[PDB]
Amino acid sequence: CVPQYGVCDGIINQCCDPYYCSPPIYGHCI
């Protein structure tokens, strides 16, 4: 899982909470 500011891509699995890719689906975690 990606922490934050890490170029990720996905809808469910791609980043790490509480952070998550955004604002779009394939971008960076926030």
UniProtKB/TrEMBL annotation:
<feature type="disulfide bond">
    <location>
        <begin position="8"/>
        <end position="21"/>
    </location>
</feature>
<protein>
    <submittedName>
        <fullName>Alpha amylase Alstotide S4</fullName>
    </submittedName>
</protein>
<feature type="disulfide bond">
    <location>
        <begin position="1"/>
        <end position="16"/>
    </location>
</feature>
<feature type="disulfide bond">
    <location>
        <begin position="15"/>
        <end position="29"/>
    </location>
</feature>
